[PDB]
Design a protein around this ligand. Structure first.
Ligand SMILES: CC(=O)Nc1ccc2c(c1)CCCC2=O
Length: 130
């Protein structure tokens, strides 16, 4: 058969404001992201990437259809974000990733390697993947 592996990295970077913002008490900017391990445009084969935030964010289900696949925000607390990658091929199962936002103990980075495996995809999707 044919196996196409698309290595990815996902997670988040964060920077402390310097002080706490008295307006809303946010302390950090963060960017949560998926990206290919090596430089490529994933919109070749990816329809969209949802980033599900804590539901006390406005518009908690964020959608990104064009690289970079990232959401930038501010806050004061760490919680799980769900990252769901949908493919242009409707017969390819979405990939669900789970990421604990890291804010605390210099840029803070929490990023994970993973691999989207396409086992025997349609020739058409194979064309999109390569
Ligand atoms: C509207 C708004 O700013 N919501 C918001 C902001 C920050 C945070 C949360 C929600 C909940 C999780 C922790 C956190 O840092």
């Amino acid at each position: 058969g044919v196996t196409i592996v698309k290595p990815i990295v996902y997670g988040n970077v964060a920077r402390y404001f310097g002080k706490k913002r008295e307006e809303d008490g946010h302390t950090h900017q963060w960017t949560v992201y998926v990206k290919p391990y090596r430089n490529e445009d994933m919109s070749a084969y990816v329809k969209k990437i949802q980033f599900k935030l804590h539901e006390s964010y406005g518009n908690p289900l964020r959608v990104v259809t064009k690289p970079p696949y990232e959401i930038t925000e501010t806050g004061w607390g760490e919680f799980e974000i769900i990252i769901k990658i949908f493919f242009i091929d409707p017969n390819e199962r979405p990939v669900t990733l789970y990421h604990l936002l890291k804010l605390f103990q210099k840029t803070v980075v929490s990023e994970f390697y993973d691999e989207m495996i396409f086992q025997d995809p349609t020739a058409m999707m194979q064309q999109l993947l390569t």
